[PDB]
């Protein structure tokens, strides 16, 4: 695309410098341009891609929430159309980043990935980016978006269950599916059963790990515990 004159490795190289500088718009466009070179990505290069687009959408989500609350406070004198126009503009920027990621996986990352850890990583991301769209959806397509996210989430679960151990951090990262249930799907008891089953089966697997791996998994198991303490 925009980055077509630059070598694949220089693009990886500059994504890591942007991270250091905290320049995540630059980081995301460098990694978009690497993806469009046509070759599969390694396990470190995949983490760069998710770190870059998460910090960018993370900022849009937070600003959309401020704006939408002012708009609703102005219902329960009136300042004009200005709040609803500006909230609409931000919202359209977020939907555009979500459509850009979703297009890179469809073209052609998911279909080329044959390893369990590649394929489960991309299918999670797909349910994450339909989720962020659902967070701001209100039309007829809102039930359709909730079902695309669901479907992508479930296919990744089935693979992870039969192909990886219960302490794998990509498998624990299932936390996100429980959030889907609680905050999007209006199914809070489903959300609670998943997080408790997930915590329990990892717990009974810790004895098999090194000190470095122990530390990685207990990180994510603590987030499952915080939510249960909040949802009860």
């Amino acid at each position: 695309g925009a980055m077509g004159s630059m070598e694949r490795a220089s693009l990886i190289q500059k994504a890591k410098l942007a991270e250091q500088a905290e320049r995540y718009e630059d980081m995301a466009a460098f990694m978009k341009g690497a993806v469009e070179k046509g070759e599969e990505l390694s396990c470190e290069e995949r983490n760069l891609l998710s770190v870059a687009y998460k910090n960018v959408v993370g900022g849009q989500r937070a600003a959309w929430r401020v704006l939408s609350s002012i708009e609703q406070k102005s219902n329960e004198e009136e300042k004009g159309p200005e709040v609803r126009e500006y909230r609409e503009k931000v919202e359209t920027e977020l939907q555009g980043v979500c459509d850009t990621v979703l297009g890179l996986l469809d073209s052609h990352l998911i279909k080329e990935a044959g390893d369990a850890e590649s394929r489960v990583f991309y299918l999670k991301m797909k349910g994450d980016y339909y989720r962020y769209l659902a967070e701001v959806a209100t039309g007829d397509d809102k039930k359709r978006i909730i079902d695309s996210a669901r479907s992508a989430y479930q296919e990744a679960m089935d693979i992870s269950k039969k192909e990886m151990p219960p302490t794998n951090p990509i498998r624990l990262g299932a936390l996100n599916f429980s959030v889907f249930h609680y905050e999007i799907a209006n199914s809070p008891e489903e959300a609670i059963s998943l997080a408790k089953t997930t915590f329990d089966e990892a717990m009974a697997d810790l004895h098999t790990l090194s000190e470095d791996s122990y530390k990685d998994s207990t990180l994510i198991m603590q987030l499952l515990r915080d939510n249960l303490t909040l949802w009860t």
């Binding site: 983490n47 998710s50 770190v51 990262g173 936390l175 996100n176 990180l219 987030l223």
Partner: peptide, 10 residues
Amino acid sequence: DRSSSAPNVH
């Protein structure tokens, strides 16, 4: 407040 989702890898 809202629920915790999975953190930025690094």
